[PDB]
Structure 1
Amino acid sequence: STGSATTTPIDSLDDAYITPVQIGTPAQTLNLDFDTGSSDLWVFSSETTASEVDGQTIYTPSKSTTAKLLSGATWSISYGDGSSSSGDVYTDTVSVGGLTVTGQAVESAKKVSSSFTEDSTIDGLLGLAFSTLNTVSPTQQKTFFDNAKASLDSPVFTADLGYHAPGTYNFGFIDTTAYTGSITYTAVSTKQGFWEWTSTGYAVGSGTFKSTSIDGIADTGTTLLYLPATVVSAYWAQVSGAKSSSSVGGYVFPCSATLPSFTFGVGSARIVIPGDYIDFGPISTGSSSCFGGIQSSAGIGINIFGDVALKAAFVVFNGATTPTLGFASK
């Protein structure tokens, strides 16, 4: 089997991407944030504290003839941005782009933090990291990809995120019309439960490429590119007037600037992030200070190849017995 679904930016900055997902019988369609940095499929629901729902579409398990309470199971998750959610668990039928999993754990939120409430466009998350990170207790549950894997034509999914435009998540096949050149594959460590790999270096604009190993994660659920402070300083030094602002929380630059590109290495290959992809617009409405899309990871504990980096490539998440990542230009 295979599946193919369009993913759409939630706003004009590509802050995140939503993909429609069918849950239950008859189908309830919710728009979920596919997150290769976490491993829980959770949704706003009829159980979510009413004051914490503000425009999201909810899953109502009592209206699904295939929903079953997973007795005793609870979940609770906190994300790198400080947001969180928790609740109980149902199993139900879940389909993405024509690909159906029966018995998928659907984690029903009883509570969500303010950032989730305030974003009416995201009805939940669909985690695509490794199932060892799933938070269901006392019986850990599998991701949608892990459950679908055996049925897929090939044990892979691909992320093809658009710049200010829709893109595609495919499951079970590699669309050879979606990229240019060849795909370069690179080793993955699953020791932390992430799609963790080592970039071979970087360049700023037309500058020379610096060969240096940068360990980080491919994370579709993170907006920006978080890299070591040395690398980030080298990038922003090429932008007149750019500075790190503790009050704003990162590097800012004059909105009048033209940003240089940023290149990262995948083995001997190179992925080029155009400068425009690094512009996240005014820090507040009407400001002439703009927020940068490349930021320091020094406060995180890990480097994160988020959407800014991933949307410059066609990305293969290879879930074979020895997982690997593949990157192609497009």
Structure 2
Amino acid sequence: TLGNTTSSVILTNYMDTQYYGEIGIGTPPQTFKVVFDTGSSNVWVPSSKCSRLYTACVYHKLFDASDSSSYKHNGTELTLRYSTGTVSGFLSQDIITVGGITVTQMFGEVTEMPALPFMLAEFDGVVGMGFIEQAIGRVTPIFDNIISQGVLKEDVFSFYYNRDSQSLGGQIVLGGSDPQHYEGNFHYINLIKTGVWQIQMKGVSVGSSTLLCEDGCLALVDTGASYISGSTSSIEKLMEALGAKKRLFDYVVKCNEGPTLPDISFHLGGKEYTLTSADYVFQESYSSKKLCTLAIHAMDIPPPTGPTWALGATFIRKFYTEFDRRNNRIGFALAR
């Protein structure tokens, strides 16, 4: 069922690495800073039942079911494994408010939240924008519950991630796209299969020559990821081609050599999606005596999804993204 409504959620941009908006859970609503993540399908927030020996829970907003009159008990255990860490807790149901839309949703109340990486998180939880196929415990994703209401103009949602400034951090539009944040026309790539926001990639070039993904590869379009990521192997080759040094969790260049780095192009569908060094280098200075982090890192995503590349905030900043559930495709347009 299609309606005549679009809703939008204003996002906060924290240092070009984290983008999140707010949702309200319960009656009266308890507000949470959440990441709208196309790379996951579950809704979760920290729980009041999280042991205060997990320091992450002392530093985040906790959902208290005892303060919500609309809460429905469930209790089923839930473990969510990310390539960055793990969270576990139990399932609960309540009313969730997302940019005007009110929806009865099943979500995870996280009771185990490791300091790495959640003490570094500015957000409290996640709103999974993925498909039911990848939903842990086969829980209906929030977008599927919003479609069911038959209120949205289109069975799509789109992302705008701005470059850091005190301006608009970003924007998610549910039910459409916002022409104020893109120019030109959308170029669509069909999903390899329904169930994952993953498209075929046919080459990654450093400069003029296609040095990587020559015989094709996968590209997960991940709104919950900060960077463009590849497998340890691909990133090693890419970084050698750029002249970057490996550290513990990132790659660096001498700050003075950042602007001189070659363009990186991603071959997706029809078009070549080019990022210049200004789009992937955290150019904090131009000093020959300082190191500058790159917005590309290695991430070994496990099968069946991985091995795959992931196009995170680094990519979405340059390219406004529309996620089309009706046609199982992803559209890209140059962001304004």
1:127 Cα deviation (Å)?
0.9
C-alpha separation in 2, matches of 1:119 and 1:142 = 29
C-alpha separation in 2, matches of 1:216 and 1:209 = 16
Unaligned runs of 5+ in 1: none
Structure 2 counterpart of 1:100: 102
Structure 2 counterpart of 1:127: 128
SS in 2 for 1:122: coil
After superposition, the Cα gap between the structure-2 partners of 1:54 and 1:281, relative to the gap in structure 1 and judged at 3 Å, is: farther
C-alpha separation in 2, matches of 1:292 and 1:209 = 20
Contact persistence 2:44–2:108 (CA under 8 A): yes
C-alpha separation in 1, matches of 2:101 and 2:63 = 19
1:233 Cα deviation (Å)?
5.9
> Which of 58, 64, 67 is the aligned partner of 1:63?
67
After superposition, the Cα gap between the structure-2 partners of 1:96 and 1:204, relative to the gap in structure 1 and judged at 3 Å, is: same
Q: Deviations over 1:175-211 (max 9, x none)?
A: 23321111011110346x4211012434435x36679
Question: What is the TM-score normalised by the length of structure 1?
Answer: 0.85
Structure 2 counterpart of 1:159: 159
Structure 2 counterpart of 1:323: 328
Contact persistence 1:84–1:112 (CA under 8 A): yes
C-alpha separation in 2, matches of 1:222 and 1:131 = 20
Structure 1 counterpart of 2:40: 38
SS in 2 for 1:197: strand
The more displaced of 50-59 and 23-32 is 50-59
SS in 2 for 1:180: strand
Q: Deviations over 1:201-256 (max 9, x none)?
A: 34435x366794331201112222123678656654564xx3342x5245321122
C-alpha separation in 2, matches of 1:164 and 1:263 = 23
C-alpha separation in 2, matches of 1:2 and 1:299 = 33
User: 1:230-309 counterparts in 2 under 5 A?
Assistant: 232=235, 235-236=238-239, 239=242, 242-245=243-246, 247-257=247-257, 258=259, 259-280=261-282, 288-296=290-298, 301-309=307-315
Unaligned runs of 5+ in 2: none
SS in 2 for 1:329: strand
Question: What is the TM-score normalised by the length of structure 2?
Answer: 0.84
User: 1:206-217 counterparts in 2 under 5 A?
Assistant: 207=208, 212=214, 213-217=216-220
Q: Deviations over 1:125-166 (max 9, x none)?
A: 111111122223xxx211111111232221111111112251
The more displaced of 217-226 and 273-282 is 273-282
SS in 2 for 1:142: coil
> Which of 212, 215, 223 is the aligned partner of 2:226?
223
Aligned residues: 312
Percent identity over paired residues:
24
Contact persistence 2:83–2:301 (CA under 8 A): no
1:274 Cα deviation (Å)?
3.3
Structure 2 counterpart of 1:173: 176
C-alpha separation in 1, matches of 2:66 and 2:231 = 48
After superposition, the Cα gap between the structure-2 partners of 1:153 and 1:273, relative to the gap in structure 1 and judged at 3 Å, is: same
After superposition, the Cα gap between the structure-2 partners of 1:295 and 1:141, relative to the gap in structure 1 and judged at 3 Å, is: same
Contact persistence 1:54–1:118 (CA under 8 A): no
1:299 Cα deviation (Å)?
7.6
Contact persistence 2:18–2:122 (CA under 8 A): no
After superposition, the Cα gap between the structure-2 partners of 1:262 and 1:302, relative to the gap in structure 1 and judged at 3 Å, is: same
Is 1:109 aligned to 2:110, yes or no?
A: yes
After superposition, the Cα gap between the structure-2 partners of 1:231 and 1:180, relative to the gap in structure 1 and judged at 3 Å, is: farther
